[PDB]
Structures are given as structure tokens and as C-alpha cells.
Write an enzyme that holds these catalytic residues in place. Structure first.
Site, PDB file in Angstrom:
ATOM      1  N   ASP E 734      13.838   2.454 -60.483  1.00 25.04           N
ATOM      2  CA  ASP E 734      13.136   3.526 -59.770  1.00 25.04           C
ATOM      3  C   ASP E 734      12.149   4.287 -60.650  1.00 25.04           C
ATOM      4  OD1 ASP E 734      14.836   5.238 -61.262  1.00 25.04           O
ATOM      5  OD2 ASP E 734      15.882   6.019 -59.525  1.00 25.04           O
ATOM      6  N   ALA E 735      11.374   3.556 -61.445  1.00 25.09           N
ATOM      7  CA  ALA E 735      10.124   4.056 -61.991  1.00 25.09           C
ATOM      8  C   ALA E 735       8.967   3.624 -61.096  1.00 25.09           C
ATOM      9  CB  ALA E 735       9.921   3.556 -63.421  1.00 25.09           C
TER      10      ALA E 735
END
Ligand SMILES: [Zn+2]
Ligand SMILES: [Zn+2]
Ligand SMILES: [Zn+2]
Lengths: 67, 45, 48, 127, 1114
Positions: E734-735
Site C-alpha cells: 500500500d504505497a
């Protein structure tokens, strides 16, 4: 604050359309959707720049230090 | 020069030092320093 | 056990007590004042 | 001494008593105590009234600051004459070698009169 | 606009929050303290007296805050924003009126100054009460500010709504290894803090208390109250035809053991083993000390003569003991929401004030007779001259108890700390979401996750989706959007009212028949024993809806036992609901259209009987319907609006119902951190650290909640053009990936302001501080350090500072504490320098620097720096649904993809969150957002409703795009199309705090602490990080035995000790100083933290003798 001079995603200029889009609302009461299509903003990445622009510059200025 | 200004009276005060901290024309006790004249050098990005 | 000097049971109650160095109990200066916040370990050693 | 510490712990309540009353700010009470402290050692507090020496000691600290406070605002709380507390002020200053002193400048008293006088909101032109 | 009562019951929810806002619970509490609850204090501490000279009396007649009686104008007051720039308290003085004995004649003098009460903002005693954006523009204060918080000496603090268990009521308890207990705490308002217990030792009922030296079995303490005939005991406790006679039968024969048998002999067995309180006279009768021992116990009810009503309240207290022993399923939990009493600010600041007020007039008493013990000083002596010495303990008592949030009371002797917090001006709703929250009591049940969990008896009382995590996980909670806390009225007239409706009395009913019928319980006390309750309760509400009784009552009526309940105690929760009479409601949309005309507000709805307040206990009996399409001919209390179960700070989530449930408690903890705008006066204020965003934008998918608190009038964050897909592998966990050309156009350029201050201190020897500056060298005034310091000493507004570069010069004298020498000899050069140096790793600018004076004439300096910055990678963004993300890479525009029209996405997030995180909101928010842009109208995402999907793809197919928003686009690296389709559209990405410009740390070799000689903990203390004990065991598992020695004494704690060989203990440079020969010494090196153990362990009588070998020659 004031309207951003260019669009964030594509790059075209929106600084000469904030007063125009309002003047298309005071006189000639008109839909928000059909206003800024006549004005020249075709795609859906420029239309968010004037739909959602909160204009906090008219409320900050009433606290000027010069009475 | 263009020394200290007032809060809401907005009158330019050049107070002699170690004398007082109020302003004239009004009793208000908050004195804002006014901006310099000296050039300052920024970028444009 | 015996055979050491301090092996008697006489040395298991306080008759003399040592005082530690001040490196253990340093006079910390909080500089909330020109007075020194002296730690709790010396003011017990003075009430003795 | 413990009795010498106890005679100033009590005498610290006295200076904070009148300074809470006359709105003396806290940088004068602490300045006033050394004037009491040197007069303590030099045999000036013996015999005289406790509550009569500390107001005379405080007025030395209020004169040095050049503040608007008079001498009779000390005495009217104490319900004695001005000349009673003023006489023990004179035997303090010349005995304890106070040479330099501010004068009672009357131009200080104009600026403080107006605020509790409740005059008009153009209070600068009257000043 | 053909209005109807099916989808337009919402339109009376603005009619609630207009007359009756969101800070009801703080404003209406202090406003009741000032008006009425001061006059009930001086009327309970009037008539200060002296015993010497008994013809002296001073009495307090009345008390007022604010205006005098001579001028009687409004006031002249230091304005609130003028008061926070000088570190002063925002306060209003207390005025009293007095008459007293001067002498020959008594004298009545008015308007005596005894103190200065602090007053919270937007109360009716401050100047901001009903202003109209013109008075409030003069005072440069924000119109959209909530209000409700003190500005004591700078910082601005807020009393939090505490809650505890219900006082003056009983709770049943169970335990296996301990038997069972019966706590019943009672706090009458005068010195009394007493709780009683009804315990069971090995099958026998008792009654213990912390003023009785032992326990007493209950058969004594009911014959002590008159119930003596010993058949009446079982007739009250047990009933008939039951097993309760068999469990209770042991306690009957302990009357035969103690051999008492009568009400006269019953008393003195108590007071024979009472712990005697020191009376200083001890008139003890051995007959009245027991008759008052049935007065200082169970302080709910007091008696006159009969002792009767106190007896069968003990009998009802011990019946639910026996029923709990018959089955432990009948027990109660102390976490049910009906057993919680919320208590406000103004009814808690009154517990503090009357402690201060009685401490005022018993120092003022003993200051009088210290003068009145004089022969001369008794005629002309006047008392108001020495009132002002004692007045300073009121002001300094109140301001010290608000700043340092611990209240040292005397009457209850209890030390609640943490009762005030500083409010956070990070964002707009970060300072409004604090004003509606709950701080619990943590009653030390740290093992049990019961109260940590959430109860189902909470639907719309207070919010369900806002609760923190981590250390505080379930003990901090938030009020919902529709909520009112009740107020206690009176219990005398309603006790007279229930006799009229046909109840009998407690002094007439036979005890065989009180279990056959029901019983009215008034605040937990039985008084009447009604029969046929359902005609009695339904005739009671028709007095309440039509308005004979006040509306803050509850007629809870259970059936596990035979009892009906009344409750008027105040300080408990409620919400309003519209009454449904039968299979047709009382909606009556002719009333609802007349509301919009503006004469029929919400308050007149409950005046007629269309709506009333129900608490959690009155929801036991009621059968609330969700929607008007769900009415049954057995169905009451239609629910007024179903999205009001979420407060004003959880309310901004769009489509909350579609989303997962732990992805709503992850956003409330981060919505209070998203940078944005604060207020309208935000370029005027000087605060400690204030984040700003340059160009914010209102969101695309709004909510009804955000337009009822005016969130979009000053929003926080801006809506990017998300193209959710994987890209270049820098978006894995979840970058997310944004482009460089959008940042240069101004996408998310924040701004950080930071106060710093100094004080020019006046000393004992009459020496000030001075701001001399710009010392010169070689034809030029400025040094490198003084290029931005100005002529007057204070650094120059408008130009930058770098590292170094003094920006406030300051000199402090060197005779800082010496005695004043009353002369003038040597005072010309005594000022040593102590400047203020700008540290920090980036150049920042000076925004504005002001100088002024505080309440006491001691000057202030408050310069406020300024820097803005751009979002490089590391800067943490979010999604408004709870998906955190480190910015991973910043690629150019030409490498980003593009659709047919040339729209380059602003931000790319990977597809690999939506299966695990189950956030279908962002998949809907993108469809309801893109269709709003093409149509030019903003759309609503509310809770339990909102803009539908099938009517939103019809707009999205007319304009020319795909029916599911999933457009197709090219690639910017390779040129050709993408073999799949990309989900494309605008999503509101708010920017958070926690940026990497002020988290990069680097310590090589720096400061060291003094007692341990280790690196200093704290990034501001120049860091050095802790290699703990969890990470020490991870090293030895590798077997590595040389960096373990290096990381734990060489780079940390090395020290060179020279220790003697025989009688081996360490000494200094070359000595042993216990065998004074200085011959046998070995140089070694050990950690410093074992040099100081070997001296702490040596300071108490333990001698660690060292014994050495050499390394070689095994
Ligand atoms: Zn565009
Ligand atoms: Zn002025
Ligand atoms: Zn030795």
C-alpha cells in the site's frame, strides 16, 4: 485560497475563468454543469478545479491590519 | 526606518527605547513590527 | 565462614554507614531558578 | 537559624499580603525582601511593630521602580496616620545609608488617575 | 416541490441543531453554574462569625458575575484573541454584596471584588454571545469556531465530560472464589462518601461497612429498624412457595444465638462494635449512637421516627442477594449503558469552587480576630480593608486547577488528574471532535476485555465508529450527532403525583402482598407498590407528552422481578424519537411543511406531543421502527433519522455502509491529523505549531453530516485523479505513485508555522534585559550570524534564516542574584550574551514578529517562523477510508499513462488492497465522483442511503465513457495499449501529518547523560537509539560474540577502570585507598554502567570483591 493558475493533471491554465464562471451565475442564472462547458473546459480533469475550489481569499481579507 | 505599527489603530510608532510599550491614538498594547524595505531573493518554483 | 576479617556476625547491623560519591547522586541543575534541584538521596543522608 | 528562618517565613506572608492588595506585581515583592533582609541583621526590626516596618520597607522598593503608588495607600489599609508610618520611614533611610533615590515625580500620577476614574473613551486627550 | 413524510423527516434535523447545537453539553452546563448554582453556594456558607466580640456579623446576601449595580452596563472586557497573544487568562470578576457590623451602626456595601471567574467562549457572559460577523470581524475571531474552552494564560484548554458508575443506586455482583458482594455507594452532598456491602460468608448474609469494626448479619439490622417479629423478615425477603425460604433459613437462627428478640435490644449490638469517631465530647448514650448508626448508613433515605422505609430498602437489597445465589444468571454487569452517569463541566467546576470559597472565608475569619484581640482596635475597625489579601486564593486556585489538570479537593479527598487537555488545532474537526468525547475512569479491571468491548445498548446514544486504538482502545469514546444529557428536576412533586394516579403507600400495604403485585421504584426506593402497572404507566406518558411533567424522565418497567421504575436523577443520556400511537404514526406532514415556513420549530414539536426524549432504559420497553414502510399495529417510536448514529467526525466518510467495519475506526484516528485549513483568523494567530495547506478543495462526494457542521466551508485535502493499477513495482505494500509535473503545479504544498518566545525578566537588584545587536567588523555591520537581525535587536520580518544566524539577540546580567548595593559605583558593562539560535536542517523564513506586555508589566517577544515545502517521497498520504501510504516514487509526466483525451493521472495506487481491506467505498466513491464532474453537480454519499448506483451509470454512459467507470488508456513507456482495463477516476486524497522532513535523525557521537554516561534519549535531546533486551537475545542466537561486545560497551559505554588485585575493588588514578600501598593494580576496561553498579551495590553494605586471572597459559 485563490484559484490555481494551472490544472494539476493536464496542465492548462485556469486563472482567467474564475471571475467568468461566477459572472455566468449572477446574471443569467445557469446550471453549474452547462456553464463551464460553454466556457471551454471539455475534459473531466479541469472541471474539478472550479467545481470544488473553496475560495477562502474573500474571508481572510476582512481581517486586514489596516482598519 | 518605518518602525513599529499598532494592532487595530495601525499607526506607525517609533518609540524611544526603554521608555514605553503602549501606542498613541489608542490604548492598545500590541505592537507589530512592520516589514523591511530590503530586497529578498526567492525562486519561482 | 571464618578466616576473613569481616567474617564476624557483628558486621550485619549498621554501626557505621558509608556515604556514596556524588557521581552516583549528582546535583542536577534544572535551571528553573538560580537554585539547584537537589536530588532525594542527599536530603535523606542529611536527615540521618 | 531555625528561629531566624521562621521569622522571615512569617515575614514573607506580610509582603505578599499587601502586594496582593495594592496590585504590586511580583518583581517588587522579591526585590523588597533584601531591603528587609539587611534591615533584619542591623537591629532595626526590634521594638517597632512588625506590620509597620514592612510597608515602609516596601515603599523603598516602590520608589526605586518609579511607580504610581503613593505612601498613604499603605497607611489607609492599616488605619493609622500617614505621619506614623512616615516617621519610621525617615529613620530607615538615613540610618541604613540609602543615598541615591528617585524623586516623587508628579507627572507619573496623571496617567494612573484616569482608568479607575471612569472618564470618557477619549482618555488620551485628557492626558 | 410536493413534500411528503416519507423521505423528508430529515428536514427537522437542521431544526434540532439550529436552536440546539453540537456543544450543548459544555455551554448549557457552565451557563447553569453562573446563573443559579452560585446563589446556592453563598446561601450555604453565609454568616461568617466570630466568638470574641459576639456582636459582629457579616452575611453574604447575593452574588453576581460580570456587571455592577451602579453602572449596570454590559462590560468592558479584554477580547479573547487579544488575550491569547499576551499569555493572560480570559476571565470575568466575581461581585458580591455584603452587610456587616462596622460599629455604632451596621452598613451595607455593594460590589466587593473577591476574585475573577474564567468564562468559556460563546457563553452568554462573554462578548461573543450573538454576534453577526461584523462585531466578530472586529474582534478577529472565527465565525466557524465551536467555542467552549478556556484561554487560561496562553494555552487553550477544555474540561472533558467524565463519567463514572451511577451513584445512589445498587448493583449485584458475582464471583466464584470470593462469594458475592453487594456494593451500594451513596454520596449525599455534605461530606458523605460511603459505600455499603452485603456479603455472603459460607452461606450466611452479612452487612459490612468501613465505619463498623466488624460485619453484622442482617437479622440484627432489620430488628434494629423495627421489623422484629421474625416472620416479617422471611415475609419480606423470600415470599411464599419457593426455594428462597430454604437458602435464607440459616440467618433466622442467629437471632436465637445472639438472643436479642426485640427492637430495643437490637440497636446496642451495632454500636457496641462501631468504630467510634472522635467527637471531642463523647456524649455517647449507648442508646443514640446506634439510632444514628441507622442514619449514617445507606444515605439514600433518612428517617424521622419510624425507621420503617429504611428497613424494607435493606430487605430489597438482600432479596437480590438470595436470587443471585439461586442462579448466577440474574446478576448485573457494571458496563451496561444504563448504569453510567455522564457529568458535565459546570456541575463539576462547582465541586471545585465551593472548596475554594469555604477556604476563602475561614482564612478571612481568623484574620479578623487577630485584630479584634486588641483593646483599642475594636471601635473604628473595619473589615473590608483586609479582604483583598484573601481574594488571590480564588483566582490562583482556579487558574492552577485548569492548567495543571489535577483538582485537589478536601470535602471528598480525591485527586482526579487528567481532567483538562489542550485542544489540537491540527485540522478543523480535530478541534471540534475533541469537544464531544468521553474520558472514562479505568476502575482497574485491566484484565477484563468486557468494558473494553462495545455494548449493543448504544445505538444512537453515542457514536459507534470513533474509538482509538493502541494503549487507549475502548475507554475513550465520542458522542453521536443526536444526543442530549438530561438534568435533574425534583422528586417531591412526582412522589405527590403518583399517589393521585392510584398507588397505595408503603405504610399500609401488607408484606404478604408486596411480592404479588409490582412496585414503583423511585430512584431505586420502593414507595407505593402499584397494581396493574400498564394502566398506570400509559396514563403517565399522557401527562408527559401533553406536558404536565418535565420530559427528562424514564418509565423503564422490567419483568424479571415484579417492579416498575422511575428515574429523574439527571446526568444521563437520551435521544429524541417521534411517538407512534398505533398502526399509523404521528408524523402529520402538514406540521412538517409548516416547519419549513419557519414558525413551527423543533421545540414546538415536543410541546404538542409529537416527539420526546428516550434514554437507554426506556428503550427496554419500546419497539422502535426503522422506516415508515415497516409500521406494525404493534410498533411504537419511529426512528427519526438512521444516519445519526455517527458523530460529526466519523460523518465525513462517504458510503460508510458499503465499507468494512474496522476501516471506519482507522479513519477517525487519522481524520484528526489531515492537514488543511483551521479558521478564518489563521494568519492572525500565533500558535505553537500550525499546519496549513496552500490550495485546499472541497470533496466531490459530500455527506449530509459535513454540511451540518459546515466542514466544506473550510476543507482539508484535495481530490486527485486516481488510476488504480500496479506500476513500476514501487507500489507493493500500500504505497503509491504520483507524478512530478502535478507537484510543480501545486499538488499538496503544505506550510509549517512555529512560535517561539522569550521573556525579558526584571531582577531583584533592578536590572533589566537588553536587546542590543549587530556587533561589527571591518566596514560591515552584519556577521554571518546577523544578516537577518535588524537594527533594533529583533530579527527582521520578511527575510530567511539559515542554521546559525541569531534571530533574537539577548543579554542577561552577571549579578543575577546578588544583593542590591544602594549606591552607584560599577554598573557599566555587566551583560553577557545568551541569544536564540535557529537550528533545523532547512532554511525557513520569518513571517511576523510582535512585541507586547503581559498582565504584569514584563515584556513579551513572540516571533513566528514560516517555511513551505513540497511532497517528496516519505510524505504520508491517505484516502479518507483508512488506507495509509508512504509516497514511494516521483516519476515524470511522460512516463505516466494517458487516456484518449490526454488526462494524466495524479496518483496511482495498487489493486492489491481491495480484497483484504474490503473497501467497496473507494470503488463507489470513484463512480459517484466521476459522474458528478461530467454533470457539474456534487453528489452525496451519506450513511444508510446516499446516491444510488443504477441512476449514476446512466449519466456515465450518456457522456461517452464506460458504464462502470473503467476506462481504457495507453502507456507512456512503450506506446501501445494495455492488455487490461484500468479503473480510472477522481478520489479525494487528504494529506496527513508525519512527514519525513522532521523525522530524519542522525547521531554519530554527541551528548551523553550524567548519571549513566550513555547516549541521550530523545530526538530533540540529540538521540542515540536503544539496543534493548528483545534485540540482545536476537544477536546471541546467531552465535556472534564480538560485535555483542562492541555494540554494548565500545560504541556505547566504554570506561577504563584500574582495580586492585588482592582485596580487589576499584580505585582512582593510581591508588587502592584501602590497602594504601598503590602497588598491586591492573589496568582493565569495563562498561561505565558496571562501575556505577559496583558503587551503588557497595554503598549499601555489600562488597563485590573482584578475583582476576590472566588470559594466557591455560
Ligand atoms: Zn485538466
Ligand atoms: Zn494605536
Ligand atoms: Zn586492594
Amino acid at each position: 485560497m485563490i484559484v490555481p493558475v494551472r490544472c494539476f493533471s493536464c496542465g492548462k491554465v485556469v486563472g482567467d475563468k474564475w471571475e467568468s464562471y461566477l459572472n455566468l451565475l449572477q446574471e443569467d442564472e445557469l446550471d453549474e454543469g452547462t456553464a463551464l462547458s460553454r466556457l471551454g473546459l471539455k475534459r473531466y480533469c479541469c472541471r474539478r478545479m472550479i467545481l470544488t475550489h473553496v475560495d477562502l481569499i474573500e474571508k481572510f481579507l476582512r481581517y486586514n491590519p489596516l482598519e | 526606518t518605518l518602525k513599529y505599527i499598532c494592532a487595530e489603530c495601525s499607526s506607525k510608532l517609533s518609540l524611544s527605547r526603554t521608555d514605553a510599550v503602549r501606542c498613541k491614538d489608542c490604548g492598545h498594547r500590541i505592537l507589530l513590527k512592520a516589514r523591511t524595505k530590503r530586497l529578498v531573493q526567492f525562486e519561482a518554483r | 565462614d571464618a578466616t576473613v576479617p569481616s567474617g564476624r556476625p557483628e558486621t550485619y547491623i549498621w554501626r557505621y554507614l558509608p556515604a556514596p560519591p556524588v557521581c552516583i547522586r549528582p546535583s542536577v541543575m534544572m535551571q528553573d531558578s538560580p537554585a539547584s534541584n537537589e536530588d532525594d538521596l542527599t536530603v535523606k543522608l542529611t536527615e540521618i | 537559624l531555625e528561629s531566624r528562618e521562621a521569622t522571615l517565613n512569617n515575614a514573607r506572608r506580610k509582603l505578599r499580603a499587601v502586594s496582593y492588595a495594592l496590585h504590586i506585581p511580583e518583581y517588587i515583592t522579591d526585590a523588597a525582601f533584601q531591603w528587609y533582609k539587611l534591615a533584619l541583621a542591623n537591629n532595626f526590626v526590634q521594638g517597632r511593630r512588625s506590620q509597620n516596618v514592612i510597608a515602609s520597607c516596601l515603599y523603598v522598593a516602590c520608589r526605586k521602580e518609579k511607580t504610581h503608588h503613593m505612601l498613604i495607600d499603605f497607611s489607609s489599609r492599616l488605619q493609622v496616620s500617614v505621619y506614623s508610618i512616615g516617621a519610621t520611614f525617615l529613620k530607615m533611610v538615613k540610618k541604613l545609608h540609602i543615598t541615591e533615590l528617585p524623586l516623587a515625580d508628579p507627572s507619573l500620577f496623571i496617567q494612573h488617575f484616569a482608568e479607575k476614574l471612569d472618564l470618557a473613551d477619549k482618555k488620551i486627550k485628557v492626558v | 416541490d410536493e413534500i411528503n413524510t416519507a423521505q423528508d423527516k430529515w428536514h427537522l434535523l437542521p431544526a434540532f441543531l439550529k436552536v440546539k447545537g453540537l456543544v450543548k453539553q459544555h455551554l448549557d452546563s457552565f451557563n447553569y453554574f453562573v446563573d443559579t448554582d452560585l446563589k446556592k453556594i453563598i446561601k450555604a456558607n453565609q454568616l461568617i462569625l466570630s466568638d470574641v466580640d459576639p456582636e459582629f456579623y457579616l452575611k453574604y446576601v447575593d452574588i453576581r458575575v460580570g456587571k455592577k449595580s451602579s453602572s449596570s452596563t454590559k462590560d468592558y472586557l479584554t477580547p479573547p484573541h487579544e488575550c491569547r497573544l499576551r499569555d493572560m487568562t480570559y476571565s470575568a470578576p466575581i461581585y458580591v454584596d455584603i452587610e456587616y457590623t462596622r460599629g455604632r451602626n451596621i452598613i451595607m456595601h455593594k460590589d466587593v471584588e473577591i476574585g475573577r471567574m474564567p468564562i468559556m467562549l460563546r457563553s452568554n457572559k462573554c462578548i461573543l454571545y450573538d454576534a453577526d460577523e461584523s462585531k466578530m470581524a472586529k474582534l478577529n475571531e472565527c465565525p466557524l469556531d465551536p467555542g467552549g474552552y478556556f484561554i487560561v494564560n496562553g494555552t487553550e484548554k477544555v474540561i472533558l465530560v467524565q463519567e463514572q458508575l451511577s451513584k445512589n443506586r445498587i448493583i449485584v455482583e458475582a464471583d466464584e472464589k470470593k462469594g458475592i458482594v453487594q456494593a451500594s455507594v451513596t454520596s449525599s452532598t455534605h461530606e458523605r462518601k460511603s459505600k455499603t456491602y452485603v456479603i455472603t460468608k459460607n452461606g450466611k448474609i452479612y452487612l459490612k461497612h468501613n465505619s463498623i469494626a466488624e460485619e453484622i448479619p442482617i437479622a440484627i439490622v432489620l430488628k434494629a429498624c423495627g421489623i422484629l417479629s421474625d416472620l416479617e423478615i422471611m415475609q419480606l425477603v423470600c415470599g411464599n412457595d419457593s426455594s428462597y425460604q430454604d437458602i435464607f433459613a440459616v440467618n433466622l437462627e442467629e437471632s436465637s444465638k445472639l438472643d436479642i428478640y426485640t427492637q430495643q435490644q437490637a440497636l446496642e449490638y451495632i454500636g457496641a462494635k462501631v468504630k467510634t469517631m472522635r467527637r471531642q465530647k463523647l456524649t455517647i448514650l449507648q442508646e443514640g449512637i446506634e439510632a444514628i448508626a441507622t442514619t449514617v448508613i445507606a444515605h439514600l433515605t433518612v428517617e424521622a421516627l419510624d425507621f420503617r422505609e429504611k428497613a424494607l430498602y435493606i430487605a430489597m437489597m438482600t432479596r437480590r442477594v438470595v436470587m443471585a445465589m439461586y442462579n448466577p444468571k440474574m446478576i448485573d454487569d457494571r458496563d451496561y449503558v444504563g448504569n453510567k452517569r455522564l457529568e458535565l463541566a459546570g456541575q463539576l467546576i462547582s465541586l471545585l469552587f465551593e472548596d475554594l470559597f469555604k477556604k476563602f472565608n475561614n482564612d478571612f475569619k481568623l484574620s479578623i480576630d487577630k485584630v479584634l484581640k486588641k483593646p483599642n482596635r475594636a471601635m473604628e475597625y473595619d473589615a473590608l480593608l483586609s479582604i483583598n489579601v484573601h481574594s488571590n486564593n480564588i483566582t490562583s486556585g482556579l487558574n492552577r486547577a485548569i492548567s495543571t489538570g489535577n483538582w485537589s479537593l478536601k470535602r471528598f479527598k480525591m485527586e482526579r488528574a487528567g481532567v483538562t487537555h489542550v485542544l489540537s488545532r491540527l485540522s478543523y474537526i480535530s478541534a471540534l471532535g475533541m469537544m464531544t468525547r468521553i474520558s472514562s475512569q479505568f476502575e482497574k479491571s485491566r484484565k477484563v476485555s468486557g468494558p473494553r468491548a462495545l455494548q449493543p445498548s448504544q445505538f444512537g446514544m453515542l457514536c459507534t465508529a470513533d474509538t482509538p486504538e493502541g494503549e487507549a482502545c475502548g475507554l475513550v469514546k465520542n458522542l453521536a450527532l443526536m444526543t442530549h444529557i438530561t438534568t435533574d428536576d425534583e422528586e417531591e412533586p412526582i412522589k405527590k403525583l403518583c399517589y393521585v394516579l392510584g398507588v397505595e403507600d408503603i405504610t399500609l400495604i401488607d408484606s404478604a402482598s408486596l411480592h404479588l403485585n409490582y412496585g414503583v421504584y423511585l430512584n431505586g426506593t420502593l414507595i407505593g407498590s402499584i397494581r396493574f402497572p400498564t394502566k398506570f404507566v400509559t396514563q403517565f406518558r399522557h401527562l408527559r407528552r401533553t406536558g404536565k411533567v418535565s420530559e427528562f424522565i424514564s418509565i423503564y418497567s422490567n419483568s424479571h422481578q415484579m417492579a416498575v421504575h422511575i428515574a429523574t436523577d439527571g446526568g444521563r443520556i437520551c435521544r429524541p424519537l417521534i411517538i407512534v400511537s398505533d398502526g399509523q404514526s404521528r408524523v402529520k406532514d402538514i406540521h412538517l411543511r409548516k416547519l419549513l415556513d419557519g414558525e413551527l420549530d423543533f421545540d414546538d414539536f415536543l410541546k404538542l406531543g409529537l416527539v420526546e426524549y428516550l434514554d437507554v432504559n426506556e428503550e427496554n420497553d419500546s419497539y422502535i421502527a426503522l422506516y415508515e414502510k415497516d409500521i406494525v399495529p404493534s410498533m411504537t417510536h419511529l426512528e427519526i433519522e438512521p444516519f445519526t448514529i455517527l458523530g460529526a467526525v466519523a460523518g465525513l466518510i462517504p458510503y460508510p455502509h458499503h465499507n468494512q467495519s474496522p476501516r471506519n475506526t482507522y479513519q477517525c484516528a487519522m481524520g484528526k491529523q489531515a492537514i488543511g485549513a483551521i479558521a478564518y483568523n489563521q494568519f492572525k494567530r500565533i500558535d505553537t505549531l500550525l499546519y496549513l495547506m496552500t490550495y485546499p478543495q472541497q470533496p466531490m462526494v459530500k455527506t449530509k453530516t459535513i454540511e451540518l457542521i459546515d466542514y466544506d466551508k473550510l476543507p482539508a485535502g484535495q481530490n486527485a485523479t486516481v488510476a488504480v493499477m500496479s506500476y513500476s513495482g514501487y507500489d507493493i505494500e500500500d504505497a503509491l505513485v504520483l507524478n512530478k509535473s502535478s507537484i510543480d503545479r501545486g499538488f499538496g504544498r503544505c506550510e509549517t508555522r512555529r512560535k517561539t518566545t522569550t521573556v525579558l525578566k526584571r531582577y531583584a537588584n533592578h536590572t533589566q534585559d537588553i536587546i542590543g545587536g549587530m556587533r561589527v567588523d571591518e566596514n560591515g555591520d552584519p556577521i554571518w550570524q546577523h544578516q537577518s537581525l535588524g537594527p533594533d535587536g529583533l530579527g527582521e520580518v520578511g527575510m530567511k534564516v539559515q542554521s546559525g544566524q541569531i534571530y533574537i539577540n539577548k543579554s542577561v546580567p552577571t549579578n543575577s542574584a546578588d544583593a542590591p548595593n544602594p549606591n552607584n559605583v560599577n554598573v557599566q558593562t555587566q551583560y553577557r550574551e545568551a541569544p536564540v539560535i535557529y537550528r533545523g536542517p532547512e532554511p525557513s523564513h520569518i513571517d511576523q514578529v510582535m512585541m507586547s506586555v503581559s498582565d504584569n508589566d514584563q515584556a513579551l517577544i513572540k516571533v513566528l517562523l514560516r517555511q513551505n515545502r513540497r511532497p517528496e517521497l516519505g510524505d504520508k498520504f491517505s484516502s479518507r477510508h483508512g488506507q495509509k501510504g508512504v509516497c514511494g516514487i516521483i516519476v515524470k509526466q511522460e512516463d505516466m499513462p494517458f487516456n484518449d483525451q490526454g488526462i494524466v493521472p495524479d496518483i496511482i495506487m495498487n489493486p492489491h488492497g481491495f480484497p483484504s481491506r474490503m473497501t467497496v467505498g473507494k470503488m463507489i466513491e470513484l463512480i459517484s465522483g466521476k459522474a458528478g464532474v461530467l454533470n457539474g453537480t456534487l453528489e452525496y454519499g451519506t450513511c444508510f442511503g446516499g446516491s444510488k448506483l443504477e441512476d449514476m451509470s446512466k449519466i456515465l454512459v450518456d457522456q461517452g465513457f464506460n458504464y462502470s467507470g473503467k476506462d481504457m488508456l495507453y502507456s507512456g513507456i512503450t506506446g501501445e495499449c494495455l492488455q487490461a482495463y484500468i479503473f480510472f477516476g477522481p478520489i479525494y486524497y487528504q494529506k496527513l501529518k508525519h512527514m519525513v522532513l522532521d523525522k530524519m535523525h542522525a547521531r554519530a557521537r554527541g551528548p551523553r547523560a550524567v548519571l549513566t554516561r550513555q547516549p541521550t534519549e530523545g530526538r530533540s535531546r540529540d538521540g542515540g537509539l536503544r539496543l534493548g533486551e528483545m534485540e540482545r537475545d536476537c544477536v546471541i542466537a546467531y552465535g556472534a560474540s564480538q560485535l555483542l561486545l562492541e555494540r554494548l560497551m565500545i560504541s556505547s559505554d566504554a570506561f577504563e577502570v584500574d582495580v586492585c588485585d588482592k582485596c580487589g575493588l576499584m580505585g582512582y588514578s593510581g591508588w587502592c585507598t584501602t590497602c594504601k600501598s598503590a602497588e598491586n593494580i591492573i589496568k582493565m576496561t569495563i562498561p561505565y554502567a558496571a562501575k556505577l553498579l559496583f558503587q551503588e551495590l557497595l554503598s549499601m553494605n555489600i562488597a563485590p570483591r573482584l578475583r582476576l586471572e590472566d588470559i594466557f597459559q591455560q
